[PDB]
Amino acid sequence: ELAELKKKVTAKIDHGNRMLGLDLVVRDDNGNILDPDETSTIALFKAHEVASKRIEEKIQEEKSILQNLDLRGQSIFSTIHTYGLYVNFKNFVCNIGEDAELFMALYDPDQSTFISENYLIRWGSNGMPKEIEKLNNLQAVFTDLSSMDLIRPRVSLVCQIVRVGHMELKEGKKHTCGLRRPFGVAVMDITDIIHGKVDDEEKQHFIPFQQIAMETYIRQRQLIMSPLITSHVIGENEPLTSVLNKVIAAKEVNHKGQGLWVSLKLLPGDLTQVQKNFSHLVDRSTAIARKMGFPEIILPGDVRNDIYVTLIHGEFDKGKKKTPKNVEVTMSVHDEEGKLLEKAIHPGAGYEGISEYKSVVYYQVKQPCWYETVKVSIAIEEVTRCHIRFTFRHRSSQETRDKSERAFGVAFVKLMNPDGTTLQDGRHDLVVYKGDNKKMEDAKFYLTLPGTKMEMEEKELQASKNLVTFTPSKDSTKDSFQIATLICSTKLTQNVDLLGLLNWRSNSQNIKHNLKKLMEVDGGEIVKFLQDTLDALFNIMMEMSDSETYDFLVFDALVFIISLIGDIKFQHFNPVLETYIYKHFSATLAYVKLSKVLNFYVANADDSSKTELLFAALKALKYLFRFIIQSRVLYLRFYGQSKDGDEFNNSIRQLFLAFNMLMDRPLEEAVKIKGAALKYLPSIINDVKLVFDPVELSVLFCKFIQSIPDNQLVRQKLNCMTKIVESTLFRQSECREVLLPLLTDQLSGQLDDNSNKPDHEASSQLLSNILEVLDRKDVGATAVHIQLIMERLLRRINRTVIGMNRQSPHIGSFVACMIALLQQMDDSHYSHYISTFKTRQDIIDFLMETFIMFKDLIGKNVYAKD
């Protein structure tokens, strides 16, 4: 709080200073007067320019916000990718007469797909809440939202309601109390609402609503001159796709007095701060919903052990009677011994779970649409030995026959696979079995019965090839079902290659096939058990070092894995990788193996098919060199001292010379590739200095850069050098008299080119940072080195500023450079060599040129008068 208040106060202070054109502040943080303490003219300018650009950004934002307030909301929402939905469910103006259940979610009409899950709310029979606790404290947060979900072309919230009570909402027949019957779905457009342009929590937008046919008072009574009506009643005979799309396209509905008051508010962030800063909208009793989708902010510890099962559609033949059988999914959770567990089904997000759950009922539909997603939560050890059954019970009109009739057909699904896998995500069909009632009840029997499409089809194929111990049963009927599975858990494995990494000892025959398939894997399943996969690869490359093609495919796979690690979506897990390196990384001799493999890689860089592979390898060199350094230090500490240090240093030097020849060979095919290679080249050599001799590393880099041609892509290599001296030149104890000549040579090449217009900024950053290292108090003695510097760092910059006296470029940078230079040197070195220049005519010319450039700098100085 102190830091943020200091920042905002200082920002508004400088805003006032500039708007009235008076003196501003320095050193934005921690003191604000620390700059005039001769700290750094470099940092002085840096503060100047950052303050100036902040001024420009603030004034343009002020000008934009003086007219419209649309950019601020979009920017705030784009700051992070973690948002939540809050509903202000005020009241329900309607009256039905039976218990009601609410189900709202997110559906994209353009994608024609649902996104989020649904939560249930108990409501009374006459527009009241059954639980008055939710009457007033109705605070709900629906998490898992990001920019990619907000970038949807049409964003709408789907709200469906299912009743609980009688089969008929009138007299005529007795019906069992406590059964599910859907009514209809309400959908509203929230595209403009989710943009956060206007924050109005009090406003309660009414939504018109449409549902299935329920009354026959005006539709049929008045029909004259042609009475011919032979039809039935449509109570629940609506496929959901067409009705949902029609409601979406619809703009207004004659609900005839039915609807509710709701307001949707977007609160950015997660439960960490919305439970503290958004307490007025997010209480402690707020329900939290996990959308069926991978998070955009893939942070560590985002624990999700939710198993989502979606019921979509299924064929239902009429059968012996013309009325299709009433189908209710009486499902339950069972273990390896078929024991029912309690509180395992969570139809609503934020509500208590139930041991058993039943589904909705339709009005004798051959092909009804369900859109029914349910969630399963089981212990990670227990879920490995769990199974789910789907018993379908025929429900009759009278309670006696409704409850007397048992499950006519039983379905089921295996939660695992015999090879170790689990149920793969995607659309799965179902086939039900009827008739016998004894073989489908004993738990130990149906453990090996067909319950999923993939296992059923593979079993029938095995029967076709070998009709021994497996024969296709005839108990199936003329119906089928279809399900959607999306298990967003943390311990599942929907990848045969995943277990293959886990248990390669069992099926090492397909090692080549698995290594080939390792490079198209989805990121989430990888990051789920990346640590285990990496180890397994380490063990494979350790114990099996005989096959070099195995080594090639393993290196390619690890390159792909570390590349996916390096993506912008997964910097959160990089600390996890660091910690796993520090705790479980047990490689001792793999460092030299990987070093030799990459030496082969660079020495064999001639293939055109190897282009992108080596490109990504050099992109991710940092992490692999981290692994190599860890393995080598582990070896050194295990054996105390290694005489293999000399040979591995020679290996690194051979890698250096391989890079030398890699740059020497023609660039026509590796322009971007070699540019990026130099771009990230010294990123890890910082930690290599911890393990190798700094003098040799520095001089090898000096030889490399002096070998870099003076013909192509100079600005890129100058950015490289910028980052180069930035690192470990502060480790100046052994890298002065060698690094300084290289800087001198590259700046001299920078000097006279007749095309150094974009070179000015690069050379500016260069000289800036070199002076930064020259001034550091953690350096020591720098007398003779600064002496040689000023021996060759004065006339050249004088000439450069003389050439670029034009006032359009960013001269003030070089102004700061030269002034820092002049102040930094003490009078002694001035007297020793700045005085000891060439002949009297030459020194007089020097003096007059200096006077000219001084008067030109002072003459019409072109700063921002601030």
Side-chain angles (χ1 to χ4, degrees):
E1 282 75 347
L2 273 71
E4 61 86 16
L5 68 86
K6 289 193 299 293
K7 288 195 306 176
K8 61 170 178 272
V9 165
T10 289
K12 302 311 293 180
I13 282 174
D14 297 321
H15 178 208
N17 303 139
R18 196 269 185 267
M19 69 152 57
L20 286 332
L22 244 292
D23 306 15
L24 307 92
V25 317
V26 312
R27 191 68 167 94
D28 73 324
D29 194 7
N30 58 90
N32 265 120
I33 323 282
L34 273 61
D35 298 354
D37 199 4
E38 71 267 358
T39 51
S40 157
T41 108
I42 318 102
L44 262 276
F45 155 76
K46 305 311 292 179
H48 302 344
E49 47 89 6
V50 299
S52 61
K53 60 93 183 179
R54 281 190 296 267
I55 290 169
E56 276 101 49
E57 293 145 359
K58 297 324 145 305
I59 190 56
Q60 60 84 19
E61 172 59 33
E62 177 181 357
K63 293 172 182 177
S64 182
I65 202 178
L66 187 61
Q67 274 66 22
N68 293 327
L69 278 72
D70 179 61
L71 294 179
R72 52 98 183 173
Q74 182 64 29
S75 59
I76 290 180
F77 283 143
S78 300
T79 49
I80 58 177
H81 303 272
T82 303
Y83 334 120
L85 295 179
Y86 169 61
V87 43
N88 270 317
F89 186 13
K90 254 59 179 180
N91 49 18
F92 177 59
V93 43
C94 166
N95 203 333
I96 290 178
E98 295 173 6
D99 301 332
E101 316 301 327
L102 178 60
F103 305 98
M104 42 76 51
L106 295 183
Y107 175 87
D108 187 11
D110 296 308
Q111 285 175 358
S112 68
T113 55
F114 294 87
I115 298 94
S116 68
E117 55 186 359
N118 56 341
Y119 173 56
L120 33 71
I121 296 180
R122 254 69 178 186
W123 210 260
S125 60
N126 308 117
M128 70 282 293
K130 277 304 296 177
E131 294 294 333
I132 56 181
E133 298 79 347
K134 299 184 178 182
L135 170 60
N136 58 336
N137 297 8
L138 209 148
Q139 317 298 114
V141 169
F142 312 104
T143 57
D144 296 338
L145 283 186
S146 55
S147 67
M148 55 185 181
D149 285 3
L150 189 140
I151 208 62
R152 255 70 169 178
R154 166 66 179 270
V155 187
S156 60
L157 193 152
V158 39
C159 161
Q160 209 285 334
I161 46 177
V162 171
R163 316 281 65 73
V164 167
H166 317 79
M167 318 288 92
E168 302 165 346
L169 268 164
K170 258 175 185 178
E171 299 185 11
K173 196 145 198 182
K174 289 186 175 183
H175 313 288
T176 302
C177 53
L179 292 183
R180 263 65 69 89
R181 283 299 217 275
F183 232 58
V185 51
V187 181
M188 73 300 299
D189 42 358
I190 56 182
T191 63
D192 61 330
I193 306 179
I194 62 176
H195 283 57
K197 299 176 298 299
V198 177
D199 314 330
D200 47 353
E201 54 91 7
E202 290 190 0
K203 179 179 181 179
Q204 299 305 140
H205 173 260
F206 187 93
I207 166 67
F209 168 78
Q210 191 273 345
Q211 67 124 346
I212 326 175
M214 281 267 306
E215 188 182 358
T216 325
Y217 184 82
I218 314 180
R219 188 179 293 263
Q220 194 185 170
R221 184 174 182 177
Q222 296 185 0
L223 290 175
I224 330 179
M225 298 179 299
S226 180
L228 295 90
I229 303 170
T230 53
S231 61
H232 311 290
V233 34
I234 298 306
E236 293 84 15
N237 312 76
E238 290 183 350
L240 297 189
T241 75
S242 179
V243 180
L244 173 58
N245 294 328
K246 189 260 300 180
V247 170
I248 287 161
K251 304 176 183 178
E252 185 180 358
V253 196
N254 181 19
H255 47 87
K256 285 203 171 186
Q258 278 62 242
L260 38 71
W261 300 351
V262 287
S263 87
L264 184 59
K265 304 305 148 181
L266 268 297
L267 301 182
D270 51 325
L271 82 167
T272 57
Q273 65 278 42
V274 306
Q275 295 183 5
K276 174 63 184 184
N277 303 327
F278 285 136
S279 61
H280 65 320
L281 303 181
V282 185
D283 78 310
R284 275 67 57 185
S285 179
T286 298
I288 300 180
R290 294 178 176 264
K291 176 263 301 179
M292 306 96 60
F294 299 156
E296 176 77 358
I297 304 298
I298 329 188
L299 68 151
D302 50 356
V303 179
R304 41 169 66 184
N305 199 27
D306 292 334
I307 294 90
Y308 305 91
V309 267
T310 298
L311 328 171
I312 295 187
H313 73 83
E315 175 191 356
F316 282 141
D317 70 334
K318 303 189 308 300
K320 305 175 182 179
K321 305 95 59 179
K322 272 64 58 184
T323 159
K325 295 183 179 181
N326 190 291
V327 187
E328 286 194 3
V329 185
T330 304
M331 54 82 48
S332 63
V333 292
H334 301 276
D335 47 13
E336 50 188 1
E337 45 269 344
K339 177 257 184 180
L340 172 56
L341 196 59
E342 48 82 28
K343 196 180 181 301
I345 292 88
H346 306 70
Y351 199 79
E352 296 78 10
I354 54 186
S355 317
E356 193 279 333
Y357 172 78
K358 304 169 302 305
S359 63
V360 300
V361 184
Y362 291 86
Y363 196 86
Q364 294 89 16
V365 195
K366 307 278 295 190
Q367 197 71 40
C369 300
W370 277 267
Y371 280 153
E372 185 175 15
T373 298
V374 262
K375 194 268 302 178
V376 191
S377 297
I378 318 181
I380 55 179
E381 298 83 9
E382 183 64 27
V383 73
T384 58
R385 49 197 62 87
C386 282
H387 193 93
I388 307 301
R389 53 98 176 185
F390 311 114
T391 55
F392 307 142
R393 181 195 305 175
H394 187 16
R395 307 313 292 261
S396 180
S397 53
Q398 58 275 14
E399 186 175 2
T400 64
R401 190 182 178 266
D402 161 76
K403 294 178 179 176
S404 69
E405 176 67 23
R406 57 174 52 182
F408 57 90
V410 179
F412 45 91
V413 65
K414 52 183 59 176
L415 304 188
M416 301 79 51
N417 289 119
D419 196 40
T421 17
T422 65
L423 180 51
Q424 185 76 40
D425 283 359
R427 311 297 86 93
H428 311 328
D429 311 343
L430 287 189
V431 171
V432 75
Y433 306 101
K434 303 181 189 173
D436 58 329
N437 306 328
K438 283 75 185 177
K439 298 169 58 180
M440 214 61 66
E441 187 57 37
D442 43 354
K444 202 60 60 184
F445 186 89
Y446 48 69
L447 293 188
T448 56
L449 281 188
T452 349
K453 261 300 178 180
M454 51 284 292
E455 52 88 14
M456 173 189 299
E457 65 88 14
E458 69 90 8
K459 285 166 184 175
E460 66 86 15
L461 289 179
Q462 288 187 1
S464 303
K465 70 175 64 62
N466 280 320
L467 196 65
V468 182
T469 67
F470 294 104
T471 61
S473 57
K474 300 180 180 180
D475 58 335
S476 176
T477 49
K478 301 87 197 171
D479 292 335
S480 64
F481 192 74
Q482 192 279 320
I483 68 175
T485 61
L486 287 177
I487 296 91
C488 294
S489 296
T490 48
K491 303 298 296 185
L492 76 158
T493 158
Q494 297 174 350
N495 178 23
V496 288
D497 193 10
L498 190 46
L499 67 82
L501 255 294
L502 299 183
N503 53 43
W504 67 267
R505 293 81 49 193
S506 302
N507 203 332
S508 304
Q509 288 72 20
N510 299 117
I511 271 182
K512 312 248 64 175
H513 152 72
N514 303 332
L515 288 164
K516 295 158 191 176
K517 298 299 183 303
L518 270 164
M519 285 76 72
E520 75 272 358
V521 194
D522 172 76
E525 312 295 336
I526 296 176
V527 307
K528 187 172 44 179
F529 299 115
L530 63 96
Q531 318 284 14
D532 330 1
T533 58
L534 291 173
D535 317 334
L537 297 167
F538 304 154
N539 295 344
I540 282 183
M541 71 183 182
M542 277 292 211
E543 60 213 319
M544 299 191 303
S545 57
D546 58 334
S547 178
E548 272 67 23
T549 168
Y550 285 1
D551 306 349
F552 302 152
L553 289 200
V554 163
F555 222 71
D556 184 18
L558 66 84
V559 161
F560 169 80
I561 291 180
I562 199 58
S563 66
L564 292 208
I565 290 177
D567 305 334
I568 64 174
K569 209 77 61 59
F570 324 93
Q571 276 82 202
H572 321 83
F573 300 152
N574 199 323
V576 191
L577 269 307
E578 306 288 343
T579 315
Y580 201 87
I581 284 178
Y582 286 124
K583 66 191 187 67
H584 289 10
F585 208 163
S586 59
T588 170
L589 273 310
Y591 69 102
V592 52
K593 163 253 170 184
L594 271 91
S595 69
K596 267 61 178 185
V597 175
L598 56 87
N599 282 273
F600 295 155
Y601 269 54
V602 53
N604 307 331
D606 319 6
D607 188 11
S608 298
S609 305
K610 203 177 181 182
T611 47
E612 72 288 343
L613 310 179
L614 280 178
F615 140 80
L618 304 185
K619 174 195 305 178
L621 279 189
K622 178 86 171 178
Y623 311 137
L624 57 89
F625 285 136
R626 297 173 187 182
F627 311 150
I628 296 177
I629 289 186
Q630 187 280 339
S631 178
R632 173 167 162 81
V633 301
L634 185 149
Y635 179 84
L636 262 294
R637 65 190 175 92
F638 280 18
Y639 294 84
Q641 157 63 22
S642 172
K643 274 75 61 180
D644 296 329
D646 302 323
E647 67 85 19
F648 196 75
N649 296 340
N650 293 329
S651 169
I652 302 170
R653 200 268 172 266
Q654 289 176 354
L655 174 63
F656 271 63
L657 199 57
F659 288 151
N660 283 264
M661 304 311 146
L662 164 68
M663 301 303 149
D664 188 17
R665 67 184 304 177
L667 187 65
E668 52 86 12
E669 46 193 0
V671 271
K672 190 76 59 56
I673 309 179
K674 298 195 214 179
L678 290 211
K679 172 182 182 193
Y680 317 101
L681 164 65
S683 307
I684 193 51
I685 78 162
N686 43 34
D687 188 49
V688 181
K689 181 266 161 204
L690 278 70
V691 302
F692 188 58
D693 191 271
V695 184
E696 322 302 327
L697 164 76
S698 52
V699 301
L700 282 183
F701 266 80
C702 113
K703 246 63 72 183
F704 124 77
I705 181 58
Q706 80 191 26
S707 63
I708 295 310
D710 59 330
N711 51 27
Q712 299 138 344
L713 287 75
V714 285
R715 51 165 312 283
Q716 296 76 1
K717 64 96 182 180
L718 283 188
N719 316 132
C720 306
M721 193 63 191
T722 328
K723 279 68 186 182
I724 282 177
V725 347
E726 169 268 355
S727 301
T728 64
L729 182 44
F730 48 75
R731 193 82 178 188
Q732 87 301 324
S733 58
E734 71 291 334
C735 66
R736 305 165 296 254
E737 43 274 4
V738 277
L739 183 33
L740 297 185
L742 134 64
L743 309 152
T744 319
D745 297 352
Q746 60 191 3
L747 65 79
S748 59
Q750 154 70 203
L751 290 179
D752 211 327
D753 197 18
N754 304 327
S755 56
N756 295 117
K757 2 175 62 62
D759 301 53
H760 67 320
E761 208 287 332
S763 37
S764 73
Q765 301 293 343
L766 279 248
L767 245 281
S768 70
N769 308 139
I770 77 137
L771 303 185
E772 292 169 48
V773 321
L774 291 172
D775 61 59
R776 271 304 180 275
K777 310 302 296 182
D778 37 324
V779 157
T782 173
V784 65
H785 301 81
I786 277 284
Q787 173 177 358
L788 267 295
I789 283 158
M790 62 87 175
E791 285 177 41
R792 212 179 177 276
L793 264 85
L794 163 116
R795 141 120 114 165
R796 93 240 198 276
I797 35 109
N798 305 152
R799 189 86 90 260
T800 58
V801 62
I802 286 172
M804 68 119 45
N805 297 146
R806 172 62 182 100
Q807 297 74 14
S808 42
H810 301 64
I811 314 105
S813 55
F814 331 104
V815 180
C817 298
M818 50 203 48
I819 65 185
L821 160 71
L822 264 295
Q823 54 84 8
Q824 270 142 13
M825 16 178 186
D826 196 8
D827 52 357
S828 307
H829 279 131
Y830 286 109
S831 108
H832 278 21
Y833 185 78
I834 299 297
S835 68
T836 318
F837 284 167
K838 15 233 62 61
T839 177
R840 322 287 70 76
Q841 169 64 25
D842 204 328
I843 188 53
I844 264 55
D845 303 334
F846 274 2
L847 262 313
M848 55 84 57
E849 294 299 338
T850 53
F851 308 149
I852 293 177
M853 56 80 43
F854 284 144
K855 77 171 56 55
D856 299 337
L857 188 274
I858 308 169
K860 195 240 298 183
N861 229 138
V862 277
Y863 313 142
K865 69 183 187 307
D866 47 3

